[PDB]
Design a protein around this ligand. Structure first.
Ligand SMILES: Nc1ncnc2c1ncn2[C@@H]1O[C@H](CSCC[C@H](N)C(=O)O)[C@@H](O)[C@H]1O
Ligand SMILES: [Mg+2]
Ligand SMILES: [Mg+2]
Ligand SMILES: [Mg+2]
Ligand SMILES: [Mg+2]
Ligand SMILES: [Mg+2]
Ligand SMILES: [Mg+2]
Ligand SMILES: [Mg+2]
Ligand SMILES: [Mg+2]
Ligand SMILES: [Mg+2]
Ligand SMILES: [Mg+2]
Ligand SMILES: [Mg+2]
Ligand SMILES: [Mg+2]
Ligand SMILES: [Mg+2]
Ligand SMILES: [Mg+2]
Ligand SMILES: [Mg+2]
Ligand SMILES: [Mg+2]
Ligand SMILES: [Mg+2]
Ligand SMILES: [Mg+2]
Ligand SMILES: [Mg+2]
Ligand SMILES: [Mg+2]
Ligand SMILES: [Mg+2]
Ligand SMILES: [Mg+2]
Ligand SMILES: [Mg+2]
Ligand SMILES: [Mg+2]
Ligand SMILES: [Mg+2]
Ligand SMILES: [Mg+2]
Ligand SMILES: [Mg+2]
Ligand SMILES: [Mg+2]
Ligand SMILES: [Mg+2]
Ligand SMILES: [Mg+2]
Ligand SMILES: [Mg+2]
Ligand SMILES: [Mg+2]
Ligand SMILES: [Mg+2]
Ligand SMILES: [Mg+2]
Ligand SMILES: [Mg+2]
Ligand SMILES: [Mg+2]
Ligand SMILES: [Mg+2]
Ligand SMILES: [Mg+2]
Ligand SMILES: [Mg+2]
Ligand SMILES: [Mg+2]
Ligand SMILES: [Mg+2]
Ligand SMILES: [Mg+2]
Ligand SMILES: [Mg+2]
Ligand SMILES: [Mg+2]
Ligand SMILES: [Mg+2]
Ligand SMILES: [Mg+2]
Ligand SMILES: [Mg+2]
Ligand SMILES: [Mg+2]
Ligand SMILES: [Mg+2]
Ligand SMILES: [Mg+2]
Ligand SMILES: [Mg+2]
Ligand SMILES: [Mg+2]
Ligand SMILES: [Mg+2]
Ligand SMILES: [Mg+2]
Ligand SMILES: [Mg+2]
Ligand SMILES: [Mg+2]
Ligand SMILES: [Mg+2]
Lengths: 31, 102, 214
RNA sequence: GAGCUACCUAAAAACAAUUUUAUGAAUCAACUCGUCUAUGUGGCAAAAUAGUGAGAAGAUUUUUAGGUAGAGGUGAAAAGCCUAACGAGCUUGGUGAUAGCUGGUUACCCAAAAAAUGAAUUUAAGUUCAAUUUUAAACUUGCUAAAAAAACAAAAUCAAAAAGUAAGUUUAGAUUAUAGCCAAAAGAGGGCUCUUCUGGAACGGAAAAAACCUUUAAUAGUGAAUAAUUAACAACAUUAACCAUUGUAGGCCUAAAAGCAGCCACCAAUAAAGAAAGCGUUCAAGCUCAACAUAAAAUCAAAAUUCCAUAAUUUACACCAACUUCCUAAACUUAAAUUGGGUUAAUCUAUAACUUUAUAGAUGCAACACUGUUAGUAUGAGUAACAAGAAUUCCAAU
RNA sequence: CCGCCUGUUUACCAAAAACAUCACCUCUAGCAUUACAAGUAUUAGAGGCACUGCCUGCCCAGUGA
RNA sequence: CUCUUAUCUUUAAUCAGUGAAAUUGACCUUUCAGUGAAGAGGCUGAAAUAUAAUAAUAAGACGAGAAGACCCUAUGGAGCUUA
RNA sequence: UCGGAGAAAAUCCUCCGAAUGAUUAUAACCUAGACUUACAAGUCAAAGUAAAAAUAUCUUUGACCCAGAUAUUUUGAUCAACGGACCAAGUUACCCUAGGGAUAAUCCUAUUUAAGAGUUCAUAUCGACAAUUAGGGCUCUUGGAUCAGGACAUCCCAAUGGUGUAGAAGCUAUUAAUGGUUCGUUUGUUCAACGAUUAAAGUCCUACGUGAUCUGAGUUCAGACCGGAGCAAUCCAGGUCGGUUUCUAUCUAUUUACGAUUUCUCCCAGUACGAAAGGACAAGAGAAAUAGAGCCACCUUACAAAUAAGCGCUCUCAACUUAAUUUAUGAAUAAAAUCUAAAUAAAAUAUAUACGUACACCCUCUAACCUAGAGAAGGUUA
C-alpha cells in the first residue's frame, strides 16, 4: 500500500520525468 | 432490501377462463354417421364447449399426414362409402367374443 | 444448517447451571451432581464399602465414589473402599480406580473378569447409569433399557452381597410395572427418586432399593 | 369525602333435588367467584362477550341504616384498599412556587466582528478573572524587515541604521464567548489519542461534492480577453547441426560399489574424450553432456436486484470555458453570537390641515413557526359503522 | 416436587409453592364503672411456628461417698 | 398433523338512507447502478413512460398511535432502613 | 495539594520526595528600582539610620470570620475533597419530573518458493523455513412457520485432463448456476450428538431476507421462594414457578400462456477386462417418483340438489447460436514439426428463442337465462 500523493505533488512528478535523447539514424541500418 | 415487489409476483386473482392446449392425444375411433371423434384422455373446458382440433405438432409425429387425406376428405366424390364406425386395431370392439388372456 | 430441534437442545446446554458448576468443581460432566444430591438424602455411600459403577464413561460418577468410600486412601484413619468402572467407551485414567473399557456387561466373559478383580468376590452396592443410544422411538428405546436392567437383576444374585443397594437409571413407559415386580421380591423396599439436576422435560427416573436378601 | 372499596356495629333475609351421615362431607342447580382458550382492542364494555372451569349449610352469600379520615384510617401483608389516575386521597389558598434543563421571542438599511487559548470553582449542560473584540477621546510612532554580538546548546527570542509602507500606545465605557470540523506537515503514547506550524468554508472545476483546486466587494448590458479543469496512449531490445575409442571396474571395512554411495587421487594414449557435468543401473550395464570435424543467427519496462454515457486510432499547434479582469454607465472591495449608527408601518393627544396631510408629545406600537389559545373549514371519506319476521280485507286489524 | 386439609390475596397483565389455619412454643400483666371487660393466671395481650410419633438430649463443683 | 376439502350463518361486494377516527410542510408522488451518516420517488449518469376509476396483496415510505423498556446527567424529588 | 528527575512545551505517561530537622557567634528599623502573578499569595535589593566590630547555613503548606494568651505583642486545622459549607450515611425492580443519548493478531482459502515424505522418483498425492499492492471470516439479540430474490468459492445431475488409472472402486485438477437438495429424536458431549434414508441431504449474501403476515425464548420488571452476602432497608451479568402492544392501507410497487428434471429394472452380458476373485462402457426398451398444465366415464368425500374436490384419471417437445477439451490441413522455423490470441476445416456441458404452438374478428343489446362473473365486462335467443 502506497500512501496517495496530493494531486499537486502528482503533477510535479509527471513533468520532471526522465527524457532520453534519440539518434537520427539507427546504428544497425547504418553501414 | 429491494423496497418493492417484483413484477410477476404470485398473488390472489381471477383463475381459469384461459386458452390451453393439450398435446399428443391419440384417436381411437370415428363415427361417420354422426361425425363423432374419440380422443384419448381429457380436453380443456366444460361440456357443450367448442374446441379446435388439428394434427399433432410434436417432433415424433412430424410427417404422418401422408397417409391421411391430403387436402381433405370429400364424400361428394363418392368413390366408396365409408363404414359407419372406424376403429383402431388395438381397440376391442363391442359384440366381439369375450377376451381370454391366453 | 442446524435444525430447530438441534438449536433448542444446544441453548439449554449453554444456560445450564450444573454444567458450569462441574467445570468449576473439576467434575467431568453434570451427571456427578445427581449422585451427590441423592447420596446426601439417602447416605447410600459410606466409607469402607465396595462399589461397582456401570456405564462409567466419561467417569464423572466414579470421581464421586472414590472420595466417599475413601478409595483414594488419603485419609489413613478412614476405612478404605473399592470402586470399579465398566463402560463400552474408553476411560482416561483416574486415581484410585480400575476401568474395564471396552467391555459389555451382557457378555459372559466380562462377568468372570469382574468376579476375580472385585474384593472377596462380592460388591456391597452396584451403581448403574447405562442407557442405550436413543433411536427416537419411545417404545423401542424404553423397551431395550428395561431389558438391560432386568438382566442386571439376574446377575445381581452372583455379585451382589446381602444387605446391598441397587441404583439404576431408567425411562418411563408401558413396561415399568414389571421392573417394580422383580425388585420388590429381592429387596425389602424400593423408591422412585427423581433428582432436581435431572432435567424436567426428560422422562428419566431412578430406582433406589436396599437390603438385599436372597 | 367510607352511597366505590377495607374492616366493624345493629336490625333483617336466602339455600332445590340426590347420596352420606350427623358434617368448614359428597354429586349438582339457584346464587357467589373468575382457571384456561379464542373473539374484541376509539370495543356492546375506560376490563366485556362466547365457551370452558372453582365453591355451593358455611371462615357461606345478600339487603337496609350507622362508625373509623390523610403526620391518618383499614389490612387472613398484595407496601392491597380509602369514589375509574394512592410508595400515600381530593379541593381551595400560600402561588406569577422553583427549574444552571426543553421550546418560543413580531419592520427596513448601513457598518464592524469573534475563538471554541490560560486560571479558579460540590466545577466540567454553569459562572468570575485574564486574554481577545469593540465604540469614543488624548497624542506619537507602529507593521514587514532586521546586520553584526550575544544568551542557547556547539528557529524561537533580542531590534541600529535603512527601505516598502499606515498604523500603534494611553484613558473611559460595554457585552458575548470559554466543546469546533476536514485537508497538509513534525512529533509523542501503538488505527485511533494527545501537542505544535499552515490553509479552507463558489454562484466555476474534480460525476453528485461543508474542508481539495481556480477566485479582491456589488450593479445594469443580445460586448471582449482569460483561470482551474478524470483521464492516459507483450515481446524483443553467448547457439540450433553432430557425436563418441582407452590404460582399468581408479584405492577403500564398502560382495561390488566400475565417471558416477562414498573416499582421496584424479592422471593415459590418441588430432579428440573430464578417472565425468547429468540420468540409470543390486554393482555392472546401459542413455546423456562436454570433446571430433561441419555450421548459422546476435536488461526492465506501455460476490451476492440489472453491464453501465454514446462513440472514435491521423487535415497542419489552436478553440471552448467563472462579474476573475477590461469595455458603456456606475462602484471604490472577503459564515456568524455579539457590538455602533440612519430611516419607517399603525393608533392616540396638542396645534394645524380638509378625499386623508404637517411639526411635535406619547404607547397594550408590527408574527410563515412556542405538539401556543379560541373560532371556522378541509383531508382521511361519502369511507368504517348503524336498522324493520311474512301475506292481506290493514299499525291498539285478522 | 411443594404445601397438611375447607378458606384468603395484587378491583384493570401474577390465584400460587405466599397469607391465614387447628396443634405446639416464647414473652408481658395481681387488677374494676366507655375498649380489654360489667371480665380476673384453666384469664387477657404481644409474637413465633405445620402436626404426629422417632433417633440424637447435657455448663448438677470435683474426688472420696 | 401427513394434506386438505365440502356446506350453512356472520362479514364482504352491488342498490337505497344516515354518517365517524387516528392521520396530514407542499407534491405535477417511477426503475436500475453510483454517491452518502449500515440509509434516495426527489442529488450524478443511464433507462422507461397517453389519461382516469373499481376490487385485492403488504416489500418500502427509517409507515401511525406507543405515557412501551435499557444508559447517562441535575449542588431536581419522593418512599424505605439505620450504627 | 506542593517540589525534584525523563519523555521534551500534552498525559489516566515513567520515578523519588514534602507537610521538617540540625546547628546558629541572634540577623533592627526604614526605603529607590525590579522579578513572578487572572485575583490572592510569593521572591531580590542600592542609599539613609541604628546596634555591634556587615548575612546563620543547610534546602516544601492553609485565606476570611470567629474564639484565645498575656500586658500589646503574640498563638490556634491530614479545613489533606488541601481557594477551605460551623455541624448530615445507606438503599429503591414500588419508584417520579426535566432533559441528553440511544434503541493489527488469530484463522481458513488462493498464488510463489522447494528442504524433506513418497521402497526407487520434489511437484500422482502431500509438504518444513519462508514469501504473498494476496481474499475472507476479575467481568459482559437470536430460533421456527410462510414465501422466497441473488452470488459461485459446485453437494448431486453434465462435458473433460493427469494418476503410484488392469476391470470395479477411488484420490486430484479444469469448465458450467440447470433444477433439486428428506423424515423423526436427547442418557453423556462448551455453539455437540443419535436413528432411518437419499442420486444429493452444498457454502454463503440479502437491517434474525421476511413480527403494519403469524409465533417461541431472551432483553426483564410489579408477586413468591431457596443459595450466598448485608445490623437492616435491600442486593446478585446466581436456581426455579407465575406473568398486557394496538393498527379501518393515503402514496409507490405488485395481482392472466408455453416447448421437464431425476431415479430404478431389463437388454448389450457374467460379455470387455482379469491368473483368479471379481466386474463396465456407449446404443436400445419399460417402469416409476416429483414439478407444471388440465379434467370427472369410474372410485372416494361432501351439498342427505343437477355441482365442487382428491385419495381418482389424462398430457408434457425442438436448439440457429459454446468452454474446458480433442482431432485434420499448414507457415513463420531447411520437418516426416506444430489444433491456429497465423490465414483455415471439424467434434464437443449447462445455457437460450434464431424456430414454432396459443392469441387474431371489431362488435347488436329493452330484457331474460348462463358450466361467464365481487361490480363492470363476456356468451346464448324455433
Ligand atoms: N449394554 C451396555 N453395556 C455396556 N455399556 C453400555 C451399555 N449401554 C450403554 N452403555 C454405555 O454406557 C453409557 C451410557 S450413555 C452416557 C451416560 C453416562 N455414562 C453418564 O454418566 O451419564 C455410554 O458410554 C454407553 O456406551
Ligand atoms: Mg428500489
Ligand atoms: Mg427432552
Ligand atoms: Mg357502607
Ligand atoms: Mg353497596
Ligand atoms: Mg338443601
Ligand atoms: Mg375477588
Ligand atoms: Mg373439590
Ligand atoms: Mg364442584
Ligand atoms: Mg359443601
Ligand atoms: Mg411480601
Ligand atoms: Mg414487594
Ligand atoms: Mg381517586
Ligand atoms: Mg419560570
Ligand atoms: Mg486554542
Ligand atoms: Mg469546595
Ligand atoms: Mg451546569
Ligand atoms: Mg529601527
Ligand atoms: Mg469583482
Ligand atoms: Mg450575518
Ligand atoms: Mg403587541
Ligand atoms: Mg401557532
Ligand atoms: Mg369530506
Ligand atoms: Mg379507503
Ligand atoms: Mg370496502
Ligand atoms: Mg361495511
Ligand atoms: Mg330484526
Ligand atoms: Mg394449600
Ligand atoms: Mg381452594
Ligand atoms: Mg378480606
Ligand atoms: Mg390482577
Ligand atoms: Mg386456585
Ligand atoms: Mg388471573
Ligand atoms: Mg406461608
Ligand atoms: Mg351506501
Ligand atoms: Mg406522474
Ligand atoms: Mg440506489
Ligand atoms: Mg435520480
Ligand atoms: Mg408496505
Ligand atoms: Mg390488511
Ligand atoms: Mg416510525
Ligand atoms: Mg455541578
Ligand atoms: Mg436537593
Ligand atoms: Mg430541596
Ligand atoms: Mg544598604
Ligand atoms: Mg475541592
Ligand atoms: Mg480545590
Ligand atoms: Mg421483587
Ligand atoms: Mg430461490
Ligand atoms: Mg468454477
Ligand atoms: Mg415487516
Ligand atoms: Mg396459570
Ligand atoms: Mg416467562
Ligand atoms: Mg420471570
Ligand atoms: Mg389499494
Ligand atoms: Mg447400456
Ligand atoms: Mg510443412
Ligand atoms: Mg501434423
Amino acid at each position: 500500500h502506497w500512501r496517495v500523493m496530493h494531486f499537486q505533488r502528482q503533477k510535479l512528478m509527471a513533468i520532471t520525468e526522465y527524457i532520453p535523447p534519440k539518434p537520427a539514424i539507427n546504428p544497425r541500418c547504418l553501414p | 432490501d429491494i423496497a418493492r415487489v417484483w413484477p410477476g409476483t404470485k398473488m390472489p386473482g381471477r383463475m381459469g377462463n384461459q386458452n390451453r392446449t393439450v398435446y399428443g392425444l391419440k384417436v381411437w375411433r370415428v363415427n361417420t354417421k354422426h361425425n363423432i371423434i374419440y380422443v384419448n384422455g381429457s380436453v380443456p373446458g366444460h361440456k357443450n364447449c367448442l374446441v379446435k382440433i388439428k394434427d399433432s405438432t410434436l417432433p415424433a409425429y412430424k410427417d404422418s399426414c401422408k397417409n391421411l387425406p391430403f387436402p381433405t376428405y370429400f364424400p361428394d366424390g363418392d368413390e366408396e362409402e365409408l363404414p359407419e364406425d372406424l376403429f383402431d386395431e388395438s381397440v376391442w370392439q363391442p359384440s366381439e367374443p369375450s377376451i381370454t388372456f391366453a | 444448517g442446524r435444525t430447530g430441534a438441534e438449536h433448542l437442545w444446544l441453548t439449554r446446554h449453554l444456560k445450564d447451571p450444573f454444567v458450569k458448576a462441574a467445570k468449576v468443581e473439576s467434575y467431568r460432566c453434570r451427571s456427578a451432581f445427581k449422585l451427590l444430591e441423592m447420596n446426601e438424602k439417602h447416605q447410600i455411600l459410606r466409607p469402607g464399602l465396595r462399589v461397582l459403577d456401570c456405564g462409567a464413561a466419561p467417569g464423572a460418577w466414579s470421581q464421586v465414589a472414590v472420595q466417599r468410600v475413601n478409595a483414594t486412601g488419603a485419609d489413613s484413619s478412614s476405612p478404605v473402599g473399592f470402586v470399579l468402572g465398566v463402560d463400552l467407551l474408553h476411560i482416561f485414567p483416574l486415581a484410585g480406580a480400575t476401568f474395564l473399557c471396552p467391555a459389555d456387561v451382557t457378555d459372559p466373559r466380562t462377568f468372570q473378569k469382574i468376579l476375580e478383580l472385585l474384593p472377596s468376590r462380592r460388591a456391597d452396592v452396584i451403581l448403574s447409569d447405562m442407557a442405550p443410544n436413543a433411536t427416537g422411538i419411545r417404545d423401542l428405546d424404553h423397551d431395550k433399557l428395561i431389558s438391560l436392567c432386568l438382566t442386571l437383576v439376574d446377575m445381581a444374585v452372583d455379585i451382589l452381597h446381602p444387605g446391598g443397594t441397587l441404583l439404576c437409571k431408567t425411562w418411563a413407559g408401558s413396561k415399568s410395572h414389571l421392573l417394580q415386580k422383580r425388585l420388590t421380591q429381592e429387596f425389602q423396599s424400593t423408591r422412585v427418586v427423581k433428582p432436581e439436576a435431572s432435567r424436567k422435560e426428560s422422562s428419566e427416573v431412578y430406582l433406589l432399593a436396599t437390603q438385599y436378601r436372597g
